[PDB]
Amino acid sequence: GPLSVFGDRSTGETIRSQNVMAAASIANIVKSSLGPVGLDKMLVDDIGDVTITNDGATILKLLEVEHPAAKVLCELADLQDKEVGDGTTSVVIIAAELLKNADELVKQKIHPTSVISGYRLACKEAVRYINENLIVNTDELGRDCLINAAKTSMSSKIIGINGDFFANMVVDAVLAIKYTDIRGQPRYPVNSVNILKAHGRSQMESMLISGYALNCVVGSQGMPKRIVNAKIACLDFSLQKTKMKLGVQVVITDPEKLDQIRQRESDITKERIQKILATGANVILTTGGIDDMCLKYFVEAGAMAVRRVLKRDLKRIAKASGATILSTLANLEGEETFEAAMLGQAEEVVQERICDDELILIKNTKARTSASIILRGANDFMCDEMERSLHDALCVVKRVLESKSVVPGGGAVEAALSIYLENYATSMGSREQLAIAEFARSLLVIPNTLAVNAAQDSTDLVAKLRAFHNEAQVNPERKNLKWIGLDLSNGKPRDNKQAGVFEPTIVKVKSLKFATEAAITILRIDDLIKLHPESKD
Amino acid sequence: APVNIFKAGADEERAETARLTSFIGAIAIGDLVKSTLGPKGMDKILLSSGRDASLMVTNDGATILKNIGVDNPAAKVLVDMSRVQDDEVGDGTTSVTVLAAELLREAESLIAKKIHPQTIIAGWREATKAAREALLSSAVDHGSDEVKFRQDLMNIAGTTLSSKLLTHHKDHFTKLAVEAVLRLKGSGNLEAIHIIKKLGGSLADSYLDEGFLLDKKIGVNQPKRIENAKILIANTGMDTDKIKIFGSRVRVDSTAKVAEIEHAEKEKMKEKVERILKHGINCFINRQLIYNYPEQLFGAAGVMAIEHADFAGVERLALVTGGEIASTFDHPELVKLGSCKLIEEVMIGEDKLIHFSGVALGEACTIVLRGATQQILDEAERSLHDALCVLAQTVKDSRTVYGGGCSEMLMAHAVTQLANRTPGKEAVAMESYAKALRMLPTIIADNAGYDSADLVAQLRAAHSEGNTTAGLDMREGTIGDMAILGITESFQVKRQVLLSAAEAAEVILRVDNIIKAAPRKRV
Amino acid sequence: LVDIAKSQDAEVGDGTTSVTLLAAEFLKQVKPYVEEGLHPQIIIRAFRTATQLAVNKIKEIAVTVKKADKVEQRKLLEKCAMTALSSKLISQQKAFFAKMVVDAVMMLDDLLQLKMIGIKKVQGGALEDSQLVAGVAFKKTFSYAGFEMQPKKYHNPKIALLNVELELKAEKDNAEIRVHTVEDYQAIVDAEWNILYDKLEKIHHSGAKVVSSKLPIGDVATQYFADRDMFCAGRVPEEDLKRTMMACGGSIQTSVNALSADVLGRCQVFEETQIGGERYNFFTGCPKAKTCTFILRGGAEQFMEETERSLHDAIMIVRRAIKNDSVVAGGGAIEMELSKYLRDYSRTIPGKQQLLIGAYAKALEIIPRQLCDNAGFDATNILNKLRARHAQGGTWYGVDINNEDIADNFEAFVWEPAMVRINALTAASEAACLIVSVDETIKNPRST
Amino acid sequence: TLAFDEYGRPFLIIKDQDRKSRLMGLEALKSHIMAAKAVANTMRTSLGPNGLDKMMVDKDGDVTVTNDGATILSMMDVDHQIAKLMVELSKSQDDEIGDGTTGVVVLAGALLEEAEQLLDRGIHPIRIADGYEQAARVAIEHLDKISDSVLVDIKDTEPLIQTAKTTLGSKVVNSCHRQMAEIAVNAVLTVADMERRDVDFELIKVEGKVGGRLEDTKLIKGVIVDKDFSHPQMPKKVEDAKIAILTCPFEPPKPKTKHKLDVTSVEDYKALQKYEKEKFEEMIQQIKETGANLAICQWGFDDEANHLLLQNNLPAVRWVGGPEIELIAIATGGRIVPRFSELTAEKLGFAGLVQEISFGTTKDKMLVIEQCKNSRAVTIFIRGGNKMIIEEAKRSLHDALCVIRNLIRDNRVVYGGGAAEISCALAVSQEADKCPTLEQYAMRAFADALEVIPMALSENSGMNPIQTMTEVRARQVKEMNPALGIDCLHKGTNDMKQQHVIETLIGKKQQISLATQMVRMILKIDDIRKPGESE
């Protein structure tokens, strides 16, 4: 009689309703961490590790979900990390609301493909509107757009200070790592900025290092811990007694040769370590290791030798100091060369104390003047969140420099769309005007949620905002009310251009595209079949 | 049916196992009792699960089947059939059981030929009618000339008994059956011939009591033997009469009145006994118990009194003494008395019984049954009951048929000769009816150990060309003349075997679907 | 949302399914707003404002007639029956039951008490085999020895409704009869038989050819009555004896000492028929019968049960229509017009009320929507047409049942009492005001 | 969701919601159709004279082989809410008419089966039900066009015997095809009230005893009761009975109230004992003074009365049951006398031969009053070779009694053998295209469903359904539609008038009406709320 599949079959309104609730269950989390007035979350795992954060993507990736419609929103946040860099809260809020309002349409006997078509049309039109209502590029604002963008993002984090202490470190660290390339690509590889943590001094004693902070130690307490005008030898082979290879055996028939052959195991090694120092090298950096025999030669020579560092770190040091990585011996059938001219430079290499720990700094480097930042917190909980907050701010500034266009914050862009799109619905409104209107109405969740989290007036504060954006479009007197948002600290509108509240254009253009497509996929899961799990075979 | 079941705790079988299990379960009944058919069959012992297991040894199919406990809902159909045969005529219970089973066996074979079950039933109806005529046209009548009639009763009694424990005692128990019935000269009550079972002696030592035996020995202070006694039977109260006023108390000012009333209580009991004694009696039997006070009064009068011989004992005494129940005594001149010669007690099996000998109008008798063991006594008693039941009907319907398979071959002949005049669609079913009829003389020979391959062929060949009295000679293992040998059966017994097997067998053929309700009280 | 149906069952009689759905929609329309502030006090204020406006408008648009005590009023009641019997397990028998319902109520006195109309179910027959009986009937309760006699053919019997015992055992449970003689023994035995016969002779010589009692009537009385050409039936329940008294125009007497022709009932036909296979004892023919009985026939218990309910609904609707002739169009017609008035009202008031009074008005669409979604009819486009027609023309536009289009329910005579919607609005809004006013719930852990 | 809200709290609406079962959708309609197919197929093989019977095994082990649908279905442990209603349909037909215990189930099944493809086409469940009613009226109006009989219920009972043969032809007692048909005719016509057309089946008693054969079934113009003579030597034959019927026990009168007789003196003790001995003379002589020679007593006798019955040659029976003493009074025309002192000759019953019937070796010796004058009560005595045939024969005769009563109430008849069903199916088809407004699909589906009966009859008769219906139906449109049916042996031609296959008009009228309503009330459902576990 019934389907002979050993699982469960659920169709129609059963799965369609569950899909929306699963999306809402996730949205109910992130809506509470929207805007500078949001509060932090605490997550505790089964074994007792406590994590505190206000990053939407970190939170969602840590929380376990079961329903496949909830996993989509978790992936949606991951897309923002790759494509945008700071949009990990609003992308889920927008997508969930599109699903809720879409459900209300299809329950009225409106075919799902009529809603999907309208959503795609309105989304494409919304992007067109945004690209015609931009504020300014980054040439007239100069530095102001970079400090403003840095502070706008950080306003939502534990380091959201009113001052410019952090903002200056963010902007200057990004600008100091400018790399040119062919076809006009002013690269800003912010991933090269080394961020360190220490449970130590207050937030206001963070260091901005010109050079590179190397997370290692000198080790043997007989080497110099401060070298001025250093030559840096960056190499990737081990300094140890030389072992025989598995395919080669030492078989001796004359006992008199035992001492010369045995001794060679240490002589062939010491011949090499003398020649990397005979070039004048002062700081020797290896990703492998240095045994007890070899350490003597650096101490006696007055050289610094740092062992067991990461390959990703040495490559960054060599590029910043002008050194070449040498792993073996070469140079035109030469036996031992060590490429004497390929040493790097630094004005100073020093090991310092960073609140009961040791850190090696390579200062100024004289080739690329890389950057590192050492963050200070009262405890581990603050330090972990500060690292994430700094990374976000570094990424936002990168986006401003790459895409020379900003849009207003404070909900101004969404308010402008909530008027334009409603009028758009009246031009092409034959059958999809319900989907277009609901697409536009879904956008108001942002100024609505912001008012709630700030404990401000709701339906009156946002309604007043919309009145200003309405007049700009129905009274074409160039009133320039399109850049007005909400001031969550006073409960009044503000001009976001004079207040300096800027966001990269891509933070909203990309979010609308990805949030819309994610919802459309979920809106086509009317049927679900689930099979019995295989546990014991 | 097994797909999309909408039953609570019930199940059903259709067209596949419904008929298969019905035929297997029902036909098995025939094989159970098959071994008891004929004069050379073996007997069964039936055992209980315990709790006074009450072991029974028996031959008769009815006593076997009624104690099995058949659970199969289709097999129960034939069990009830064998009950009816036992209740109606009291003989042939094995023959009707195995005949119905053989008919059903053939029906399963006919279904295998893809013959519609309604065609099979229709064929058996026509074959049954053919067999009924064979019995009607072959009946033997007996009217007057009593020297020939009595011989018929001896033949019927001998035939029935030959199949039971009382095999080599025929020269004693044949007369006990025929003469006991002839002495009744009246209604076939089947209670006027009482059997008393005693251990001691052999079966050949049983005898017929010309008079009537009573239990409950002759009193305490009463004569033990009176010659030419007048017998009075009664169904009245001896003491605690509590005459017909419900809710009456004696309420007096002193105990002197209680003593005076107590004397009056006994004076009326004295008068009551005197009113009975004015009848002029020697022997008094009362259904109700006799108390110390009337016992002295009857003793002083020289009159014996028996208490509670049995519930129906007084009714039986009325028939064998020629009197009346006499539950009330207020007109002695309207009360009839009986008469006998001796009222002496006799010793039978170390037990003193009251013997009423020489009783006038004695339309009753008692058989004294002796045996070595209790199993012998119980089976021998049943043999007497079975023979008396048939004889009580033979004396009412004198029509008989020839036994030894003669009647069965005559019925099979009529069915065969007419089946060959019918179209094949139905003839195949009529022939199967005749084949079942011929299984009965085959089973009889097979139980004895005779070469049935030749006895059946010779008997059929005989009846094919006259020889309408030919049958099985179970002594030599050949074919003989039933009239000369004296092997006959009651017409009514044979008629019912034919009709009952046919009617019962149809019940199974008509069913294609069994629906079994959820059981109760099974955990 | 269940308790409000209990109240509507008492106040309206059929306001059931509609009040639960409307109350649910009142909450749904405000659901997206109550999650973001919106102090509960202003929600209650808006609910009360819109509620009072809606019920006032109904009174201003309901229609009445001036043709009382005429065939026009009887026809009005039949129109109400057509909508009362709608949405029941009735296909072509609407006019069959309606004609009986309208007359069954109009034949009542000026109390129109519902206890004067009895409905009894008899298995067997179709809906169209039911019959309306002028008088009463009962199911022929436990019979005694002799009830196979007493012929059931009477053309002008009188009816004695008694509460007297007619058994031999006239015992008071406390009597001890102390007897000292045999002459007195028999005198007491004869007295017990004389007491029974004295009562029986007092019942006789009255013309009461039919005698009925709630108490036992024994075998001796059955045989006495049979030979004296009288019919009896005892153990009749008081519920039927009360109706019988009002149907036959007599009285119920307890003592037999005061019986006469002035307390007996009268009818023309007293017979026991075989409707449904079982025997049923009918009275009919009394011209002064203040009650009636409706015998339902059908092919199943559940089939008849649903029929009985449809008869209770129709009786209640036409009863109220007799006393209150103010009616409105049925379907969703009035709901579209009420939403029009409320929307015009709300759009003239500034402030937060615009999101609350309008939400109340929007909830009123659930009726024409559900009246379409349950059978197709393209509910979206039907609503689009209704909102355009109600803005230009009449106020009674609803959804047709035959064609998938709009029709004027007033010209189609799809009418219901105005109080149906006034009461439904009151309860639905009252429930909404109670639900949104709760902030905390406490559950005791004890369950025993 | 249930047991989970958006905020992580449990979501509980109804008690034990996690252990309920709920289905609406379109699958509730499919489930109802599936259950209906199981019921219709169950009885399909027991339709018509060539159908086969079922063996029903009761919960207590009793086994009955049944032909009638009412017993077949009533003994099934059905666990489905709609299947039980289909059982109730058969019950209603058994109560109203007593014939179509299978027909209403097979017909209702076909209507529900056709609903399957009608629903698949997208036809609203209500439209299907409404179309069936619209077409049902056409079949009914056509059914009433063809009917005629000349039964007068006096002497020309030939067409009435033929009707009884048709009714009994499908039963297990065909060996008495004629004998039992005539018994049923005489049983009803001698008790029915021809002046009002009222038939009271309480006047026809059904008795039986295991033993004998079906050919021994007799109609007794009188009563059969359990024998229990007060005295064992009473005569076995009464030549001319004058019957005194009492419900007073044969014992001195006792008061019904608390008594407690006071006895003080010896004169009181002896006198009371004397007075009581004189009272037994009165209760007996008061019977003889009326000329009575047979007493009927609901109560027992005391010992002293038993002897007095002998002295006065007054036979009597004791402990006669409730309906037995009432039946004797009706059959003999007498009255029950409350007391002995109220006895009078005017209240005596009049009867002729009274004797006992002995059965085999049993001790029952039932007492029968065989001769009577203008009795309005009869007894039918059923015999048989086993319990199985007897109990079914009792029900088979009941059907024969019902169809006679049905003709007495309404003497309009129709032709059977499928002729009435095929003719109605053709009539609906002719109007189905006049006019196909909206419901063309339902009007044709109804007409096809009407043919489920002659097709199932063809299958049970071994014929090819679609080949048989093609030939039969074609003959009925080529000529002025004659009443053609089907059979297994064909009996020459298939003219139902010459085969004498007679059925009642009101029977089939009710089969159509009851099936039509039952189908509607089980299609117009979209919610199944069966509970789950019992605890």
Swiss-Prot record, chain A:
Phosphoprotein recorded as keyword: yes
Identification of the protein by name: T-complex protein 1 subunit alpha
Subcellular location, record wording: Cytoplasm, Cytosol; Cytoplasm, Cytoskeleton, Microtubule organizing center, Centrosome
Modified residues (Phosphotyrosine): Y179
Positions with a binding annotation for Mg(2+): D86
Gene Ontology terms, MF aspect: ATP binding; ATP hydrolysis activity; ATP-dependent protein folding chaperone; protein folding chaperone; RNA binding; ubiquitin protein ligase binding; unfolded protein binding
EC number: 3.6.1.-
Annotated positions of the N6-acetyllysine modification: K197, K398, K492
Catalysed reaction equations from the record: ATP + H2O = ADP + phosphate + H(+)
Any GO BP: positive regulation of telomerase RNA localization to Cajal body
Keywords (A to Z) from UniProt: Acetylation, ATP-binding, Chaperone, Cytoplasm, Cytoskeleton, Disease variant, Epilepsy, Hydrolase, Intellectual disability, Nucleotide-binding, Phosphoprotein
Binding residues for ADP: G35, G87, T88, T89, S90, S156, K157, G410, E503
Swiss-Prot record, chain B:
Record has Nuclease as a keyword: no
Descriptive protein name: T-complex protein 1 subunit beta
Reaction(s) the record says it catalyses: ATP + H2O = ADP + phosphate + H(+)
Residues bound to ADP: G38, G92, T93, T94, S95, S162, S163, G404, E489, K494
Complex formation: Component of the chaperonin-containing T-complex (TRiC), a hexadecamer composed of two identical back-to-back stacked rings enclosing a protein folding chamber. Each ring is made up of eight different subunits: TCP1/CCT1, CCT2, CCT3, CCT4, CCT5, CCT6A/CCT6, CCT7, CCT8. Interacts with PACRG. Interacts with FLCN. Interacts with DLEC1. Interacts with SVEP1.
Top EC class for this record: hydrolase
Any single GO BP term: binding of sperm to zona pellucida
The entry's keywords: Acetylation, ATP-binding, Chaperone, Cytoplasm, Hydrolase, Isopeptide bond, Nucleotide-binding, Phosphoprotein, Ubl conjugation
Cross-link (Glycyl lysine isopeptide (Lys-Gly) (interchain with G-Cter in SUMO2)): K242
A single GO molecular function term of this UniProt record: unfolded protein binding
E.C. designation(s): 3.6.1.-
Residues bound to ATP: G38, G92, T93, T94, E489, K494
InterPro entries: Chap_CCT_beta, Chaperone_TCP-1, Chaperonin_TCP-1_CS, Cpn60/GroEL/TCP-1, GroEL-like_apical_dom_sf, GROEL-like_equatorial_sf, TCP-1-like_intermed_sf, TCP-1_chaperonin
Modified residues (Phosphoserine): S54, S254
GO cellular component: azurophil granule lumen; cell body; chaperonin-containing T-complex; cytosol; extracellular exosome; extracellular region; microtubule; zona pellucida receptor complex
Subcellular location: Cytoplasm
Binding positions (Mg(2+)): D91
List of residues that carry Phosphothreonine: T255
PANTHER family referenced in this protein's UniProt entry, alphabetically: CHAPERONIN
UniProtKB/Swiss-Prot annotation, chain C:
Protein localization: Cytoplasm
GO BP annotations listed: binding of sperm to zona pellucida; chaperone mediated protein folding independent of cofactor; chaperone-mediated protein folding; positive regulation of protein localization to Cajal body; positive regulation of telomerase RNA localization to Cajal body; positive regulation of telomere maintenance via telomerase; protein folding; protein stabilization
Protein keywords: Acetylation, ATP-binding, Chaperone, Cytoplasm, Hydrolase, Isopeptide bond, Methylation, Nucleotide-binding, Ubl conjugation
A GO term, aspect molecular function: protein folding chaperone
Residues the record lists as binding Mg(2+): D14
Residues modified to N6-acetyllysine: K172, K242
One GO location term (cellular component): cytosol
Binding site for ATP: G15, S18, R320, G331, R421
Enzyme nomenclature, EC number: 3.6.1.-
Domain of life the protein comes from: Eukaryota
Subunit note: Component of the chaperonin-containing T-complex (TRiC), a hexadecamer composed of two identical back-to-back stacked rings enclosing a protein folding chamber. Each ring is made up of eight different subunits: TCP1/CCT1, CCT2, CCT3, CCT4, CCT5, CCT6A/CCT6, CCT7, CCT8. Interacts with PACRG. Interacts with DLEC1.
Family stated for the protein in its record: Belongs to the TCP-1 chaperonin family.
Function field: Component of the chaperonin-containing T-complex (TRiC), a molecular chaperone complex that assists the folding of actin, tubulin and other proteins upon ATP hydrolysis. The TRiC complex mediates the folding of WRAP53/TCAB1, thereby regulating telomere maintenance.
Record-given protein name: T-complex protein 1 subunit eta
The species this protein was found in: Homo sapiens (Human)
From Swiss-Prot, chain D:
Sequence positions that bind ADP: G48, G100, T101, T102, S170, G417, D487, E503, K508
Catalysed conversion reaction: ATP + H2O = ADP + phosphate + H(+)
Biological process according to GO: binding of sperm to zona pellucida; chaperone mediated protein folding independent of cofactor; chaperone-mediated protein folding; positive regulation of protein localization to Cajal body; positive regulation of telomerase RNA localization to Cajal body; positive regulation of telomere maintenance via telomerase; protein folding; protein stabilization
Binding-site residues, ATP: G48, T101, T102, G417
Induction: Down-regulated in response to enterovirus 71 (EV71) infection (at protein level).
GO CC annotations, alphabetized: cell body; centrosome; chaperonin-containing T-complex; cytosol; extracellular exosome; microtubule
Classification via PROSITE patterns: TCP1_1, TCP1_2, TCP1_3
EC number per UniProt: 3.6.1.-
Keywords: Acetylation, ATP-binding, Chaperone, Cytoplasm, Cytoskeleton, Disease variant, Hydrolase, Isopeptide bond, Neuropathy, Nucleotide-binding, Phosphoprotein, Ubl conjugation
Superkingdom to which the source organism belongs: Eukaryota
Residue sites binding Mg(2+) per the record: D99
List of residues that carry Phosphoserine: S21, S341, S534
Site of covalent link Glycyl lysine isopeptide (Lys-Gly) (interchain with G-Cter in SUMO2): K15, K205, K209, K260, K270, K274, K387
Compartments, record wording: Cytoplasm; Cytoplasm, Cytoskeleton, Microtubule organizing center, Centrosome
Record note on modification: Ubiquitinated by the DCX(DCAF12) complex specifically recognizes the diglutamate (Glu-Glu) at the C-terminus, leading to its degradation.
Coiled-coil regions listed in the entry: none
Pfam families noted in UniProt: Cpn60_TCP1
UniProt record similarity statement: Belongs to the TCP-1 chaperonin family.
Protein name from the UniProt record: T-complex protein 1 subunit epsilon
Organism expressing this protein natively: Homo sapiens
Gene of this entry: CCT5
